[PDB]
Structure formats: C-alpha cells, structure tokens
Motif scaffolding. Structure first.
Motif, PDB file in Angstrom:
ATOM      1  N   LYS A  15       0.810  -1.065  -0.103  1.00  0.00           N
ATOM      2  CA  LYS A  15       0.051  -0.060  -0.019  1.00  0.00           C
ATOM      3  C   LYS A  15       0.803   1.534   0.076  1.00  0.00           C
ATOM      4  CE  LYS A  15      -4.082  -2.026   2.545  1.00  0.00           C
ATOM      5  NZ  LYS A  15      -5.118  -1.649   3.368  1.00  0.00           N
ATOM      6  N   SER A  22      -0.974  -4.514  -0.236  1.00  0.00           N
ATOM      7  CA  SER A  22      -2.148  -3.883  -0.965  1.00  0.00           C
ATOM      8  C   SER A  22      -3.288  -5.001  -1.688  1.00  0.00           C
ATOM      9  CB  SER A  22      -1.670  -3.035  -2.084  1.00  0.00           C
ATOM     10  OG  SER A  22      -2.715  -2.595  -2.951  1.00  0.00           O
ATOM     11  N   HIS A  23      -4.557  -4.838  -1.841  1.00  0.00           N
ATOM     12  CA  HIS A  23      -5.606  -5.746  -2.266  1.00  0.00           C
ATOM     13  C   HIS A  23      -4.995  -5.805  -3.892  1.00  0.00           C
ATOM     14  CE1 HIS A  23      -9.134  -5.134  -4.815  1.00  0.00           C
ATOM     15  NE2 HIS A  23      -8.721  -3.912  -4.681  1.00  0.00           N
ATOM     16  N   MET A  24      -4.273  -4.760  -4.405  1.00  0.00           N
ATOM     17  CA  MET A  24      -3.697  -4.823  -5.869  1.00  0.00           C
ATOM     18  C   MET A  24      -2.722  -6.098  -6.084  1.00  0.00           C
ATOM     19  SD  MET A  24      -1.671  -2.061  -8.026  1.00  0.00           S
ATOM     20  CE  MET A  24      -0.707  -2.362  -9.286  1.00  0.00           C
ATOM     21  N   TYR A  27      -4.516  -9.010  -7.884  1.00  0.00           N
ATOM     22  CA  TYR A  27      -4.800  -8.808  -9.293  1.00  0.00           C
ATOM     23  C   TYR A  27      -3.388  -8.877 -10.306  1.00  0.00           C
ATOM     24  CZ  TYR A  27      -9.588  -7.812  -8.549  1.00  0.00           C
ATOM     25  OH  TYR A  27     -10.824  -7.972  -8.056  1.00  0.00           O
ATOM     26  N   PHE A  52     -10.052  -4.365 -16.629  1.00  0.00           N
ATOM     27  CA  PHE A  52     -10.297  -3.475 -15.468  1.00  0.00           C
ATOM     28  C   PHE A  52      -9.108  -2.429 -15.649  1.00  0.00           C
ATOM     29  CE2 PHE A  52     -13.466  -6.228 -14.775  1.00  0.00           C
ATOM     30  CZ  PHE A  52     -13.640  -6.683 -13.500  1.00  0.00           C
ATOM     31  N   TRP A  53      -7.902  -2.431 -16.165  1.00  0.00           N
ATOM     32  CA  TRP A  53      -6.757  -1.832 -15.843  1.00  0.00           C
ATOM     33  C   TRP A  53      -6.785  -0.762 -17.209  1.00  0.00           C
ATOM     34  CZ3 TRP A  53      -2.080  -3.281 -12.830  1.00  0.00           C
ATOM     35  CH2 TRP A  53      -2.122  -4.411 -12.094  1.00  0.00           C
ATOM     36  N   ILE A  99      -7.742   2.257 -12.639  1.00  0.00           N
ATOM     37  CA  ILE A  99      -8.697   0.971 -12.678  1.00  0.00           C
ATOM     38  C   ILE A  99     -10.146   1.387 -12.842  1.00  0.00           C
ATOM     39  CG2 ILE A  99      -9.363  -0.977 -11.286  1.00  0.00           C
ATOM     40  CD1 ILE A  99      -6.295  -0.682 -12.120  1.00  0.00           C
ATOM     41  N   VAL A 101     -14.071  -0.228 -13.400  1.00  0.00           N
ATOM     42  CA  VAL A 101     -15.025  -1.433 -13.612  1.00  0.00           C
ATOM     43  C   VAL A 101     -16.466  -0.663 -13.622  1.00  0.00           C
ATOM     44  CG1 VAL A 101     -15.826  -3.533 -12.559  1.00  0.00           C
ATOM     45  CG2 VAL A 101     -13.607  -2.361 -11.759  1.00  0.00           C
ATOM     46  N   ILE A 104     -20.027  -1.379 -12.047  1.00  0.00           N
ATOM     47  CA  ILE A 104     -20.193  -0.780 -10.387  1.00  0.00           C
ATOM     48  C   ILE A 104     -19.719   0.450 -10.330  1.00  0.00           C
ATOM     49  CG2 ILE A 104     -20.464  -3.060  -9.373  1.00  0.00           C
ATOM     50  CD1 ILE A 104     -17.105  -2.571  -9.001  1.00  0.00           C
ATOM     51  N   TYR A 106     -16.806   1.917 -10.534  1.00  0.00           N
ATOM     52  CA  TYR A 106     -15.795   2.154  -9.808  1.00  0.00           C
ATOM     53  C   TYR A 106     -14.531   2.707 -10.819  1.00  0.00           C
ATOM     54  CZ  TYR A 106     -11.731   0.215  -7.398  1.00  0.00           C
ATOM     55  OH  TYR A 106     -10.279   0.114  -6.614  1.00  0.00           O
ATOM     56  N   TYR A 110      -4.733   5.053  -8.247  1.00  0.00           N
ATOM     57  CA  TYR A 110      -3.986   4.533  -7.089  1.00  0.00           C
ATOM     58  C   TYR A 110      -2.552   4.605  -7.289  1.00  0.00           C
ATOM     59  CZ  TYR A 110      -8.321   2.702  -5.854  1.00  0.00           C
ATOM     60  OH  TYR A 110      -9.658   2.204  -5.416  1.00  0.00           O
ATOM     61  N   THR A 112       0.887   2.492  -5.800  1.00  0.00           N
ATOM     62  CA  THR A 112       1.196   1.381  -4.855  1.00  0.00           C
ATOM     63  C   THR A 112       2.900   1.281  -5.184  1.00  0.00           C
ATOM     64  OG1 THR A 112       0.796  -0.260  -6.358  1.00  0.00           O
ATOM     65  CG2 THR A 112      -0.887   0.423  -4.692  1.00  0.00           C
TER      66      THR A 112
HETATM   67  C1  COH Z   1      -5.046  -3.410 -10.111  1.00  0.00           C
HETATM   68  C2  COH Z   1      -5.448  -3.222  -9.000  1.00  0.00           C
HETATM   69  C3  COH Z   1      -6.576  -3.137  -8.401  1.00  0.00           C
HETATM   70  C4  COH Z   1      -7.780  -3.518  -9.237  1.00  0.00           C
HETATM   71  C5  COH Z   1      -8.049  -4.519 -10.569  1.00  0.00           C
HETATM   72  C6  COH Z   1      -9.194  -3.068  -8.406  1.00  0.00           C
HETATM   73  C7  COH Z   1     -10.568  -3.368  -8.814  1.00  0.00           C
HETATM   74  C8  COH Z   1     -11.370  -3.516  -7.740  1.00  0.00           C
HETATM   75  C9  COH Z   1     -12.624  -4.023  -7.676  1.00  0.00           C
HETATM   76  C10 COH Z   1     -13.099  -4.976  -8.928  1.00  0.00           C
HETATM   77  C11 COH Z   1     -14.303  -5.262  -9.387  1.00  0.00           C
HETATM   78  C12 COH Z   1     -13.371  -4.083  -6.556  1.00  0.00           C
HETATM   79  C13 COH Z   1     -14.662  -4.842  -5.999  1.00  0.00           C
HETATM   80  C14 COH Z   1     -12.448  -3.147  -5.815  1.00  0.00           C
HETATM   81  C15 COH Z   1     -12.953  -2.735  -4.215  1.00  0.00           C
HETATM   82  C16 COH Z   1     -12.172  -1.916  -3.509  1.00  0.00           C
HETATM   83  N1  COH Z   1     -10.827  -1.588  -3.866  1.00  0.00           N
HETATM   84 CO1  COH Z   1      -9.496  -1.943  -5.533  1.00  0.00          CO
HETATM   85  N2  COH Z   1      -8.738  -2.270  -7.081  1.00  0.00           N
HETATM   86  C17 COH Z   1      -7.096  -2.321  -7.482  1.00  0.00           C
HETATM   87  C18 COH Z   1      -6.324  -1.889  -6.663  1.00  0.00           C
HETATM   88  C19 COH Z   1      -6.689  -0.934  -5.380  1.00  0.00           C
HETATM   89  C20 COH Z   1      -5.738  -0.269  -4.539  1.00  0.00           C
HETATM   90  C21 COH Z   1      -4.396   0.327  -4.920  1.00  0.00           C
HETATM   91  C22 COH Z   1      -6.641   0.256  -3.367  1.00  0.00           C
HETATM   92  C23 COH Z   1      -6.231   1.243  -2.134  1.00  0.00           C
HETATM   93  C24 COH Z   1      -6.022   0.303  -1.123  1.00  0.00           C
HETATM   94  C25 COH Z   1      -5.036  -0.976  -1.341  1.00  0.00           C
HETATM   95  O1  COH Z   1      -5.357  -1.950  -1.048  1.00  0.00           O
HETATM   96  O2  COH Z   1      -3.840  -0.513  -1.746  1.00  0.00           O
HETATM   97  C26 COH Z   1      -7.964  -0.404  -3.589  1.00  0.00           C
HETATM   98  C27 COH Z   1      -8.981  -0.166  -2.685  1.00  0.00           C
HETATM   99  C28 COH Z   1     -10.276  -0.863  -3.041  1.00  0.00           C
HETATM  100  C29 COH Z   1     -11.219  -0.472  -1.659  1.00  0.00           C
HETATM  101  C30 COH Z   1     -11.392   0.281  -0.370  1.00  0.00           C
HETATM  102  C31 COH Z   1     -10.471  -0.480   0.524  1.00  0.00           C
HETATM  103  C32 COH Z   1      -9.451   0.281   0.960  1.00  0.00           C
HETATM  104  O3  COH Z   1      -8.605  -0.201   1.664  1.00  0.00           O
HETATM  105  O4  COH Z   1      -9.307   1.593   0.933  1.00  0.00           O
HETATM  106  C33 COH Z   1     -12.443  -1.304  -2.228  1.00  0.00           C
HETATM  107  C34 COH Z   1     -13.794  -1.522  -1.585  1.00  0.00           C
HETATM  108  N3  COH Z   1      -7.926  -1.474  -4.757  1.00  0.00           N
HETATM  109  N4  COH Z   1     -11.243  -2.539  -6.354  1.00  0.00           N
END
Ligand code: COH
Length: 124
Positions: A15, A22-24, A27, A52-53, A99, A101, A104, A106, A110, A112
């Motif tokens: 993160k 990171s939840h990244m 992916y 999504f990217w 990113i 989507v 939804i 979204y 970000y 990272t």
């Molecule tokens: C390529 C990476 C990537 C993808 C494909 C992606 C696509 C998606 C996706 C697809 C359907 C969903 C349901 C989500 C849902 C979330 N994402 Co991302 N996000 C991604 C990288 C991030 C990053 C970076 C953050 C900021 C917090 C972290 O985890 O680093 C993030 C935060 C989140 C948060 C907020 C939680 C937080 O810790 O702040 C939700 C909810 N998410 N995202």
C-alpha cells in the motif's frame, strides 16, 4: 535475432505509505519472471482482470519511467502479460494505475509499490 534467459521472481504489491499488502497484489499473478533479452532486463508479469486496468505506469524508486510492452492478451481469461523494463539491483517499483470497473461505477487512480522478494539479479 534475439536470445533470452529467464528465472522466476516473486513480489508483493504494498500500500501507498505502508508495508501492508495492497489488495492490488491479488490482481497480479505470482511469482513473476525476470527475463534477460539481448542484454536488456524485463520483469514479466500477468495482470488479472486485464480489462479493468485502464492505465498503468511503472517507475523505479528514483521516479525514472520504466517502459512496458504487451506480450499477450487473453480475452477468455481476461489477462494481459506485460514486460516492464528494469535493471539488475532493482528492489521495488512504484506503480500508478487507473482502474475502471464500469458496471459498478468504480473509477479510481492509485499509487502502490511492488516489492521484489530479492533484487533483480544479473543473468547469464
Ligand atoms: C489493479 C489493482 C486493482 C484492481 C483491479 C481493483 C479493482 C477493484 C474491484 C473489482 C471489481 C473491486 C470490487 C475493488 C474494491 C475496492 N478496492 Co480496488 N482495485 C485495485 C487496486 C486498489 C488499490 C491500490 C486500493 C487502495 C488500497 C489498497 O489495497 O492498496 C484499492 C481499494 C479498494 C477498496 C477500498 C478499501 C481500502 O483499503 O481503501 C475497495 C472497496 N484497490 N477494487
């Protein structure tokens, strides 16, 4: 002509401002690969849900740009394989991703940091 040598390299995306996973990280596929191709080095990585990217950029720790090249797009699996230009000794990359989507609504940018398990090696 080109000649190439490779080995696996693991990593974790962490993160912004933190060492936390990171939840990244979920992916991108693991481990990645280091390739030496015509005396040039690449980190080869597979993006999950590639659709999504919308944008991605990679930088070294000193903010130099690291060019990317697409080497595979798999529509069925929704994956993209890329090479990121690196140098031996690199320990981390900064990534900036856009990113999207659309089902939804979204839509986020970000930053990272991708941390290699060990530094990019020299290869023979
Ligand atoms: C390529 C990476 C990537 C993808 C494909 C992606 C696509 C998606 C996706 C697809 C359907 C969903 C349901 C989500 C849902 C979330 N994402 Co991302 N996000 C991604 C990288 C991030 C990053 C970076 C953050 C900021 C917090 C972290 O985890 O680093 C993030 C935060 C989140 C948060 C907020 C939680 C937080 O810790 O702040 C939700 C909810 N998410 N995202």
């Amino acid at each position: 002509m080109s000649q190439a040598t490779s080995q696996p390299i693991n990593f974790q995306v962490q993160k912004d401002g933190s060492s936390e996973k990171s939840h990244m990280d979920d992916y991108m596929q693991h481990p990645g690969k280091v390739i030496k191709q015509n005396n040039k080095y690449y980190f080869q990585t597979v993006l999950n849900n590639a659709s999504f990217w919308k944008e991605y950029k990679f930088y070294n720790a000193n903010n130099q740009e690291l060019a990317t090249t697409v080497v595979n797009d798999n529509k069925k699996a929704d994956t993209r394989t890329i090479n990121v230009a690196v140098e031996p000794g690199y320990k981390s990359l900064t990534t900036k991703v856009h990113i999207v989507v659309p089902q939804i609504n979204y839509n986020h940018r970000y930053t990272t940091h991708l941390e290699f398990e060990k530094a990019i090696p020299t290869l023979a």
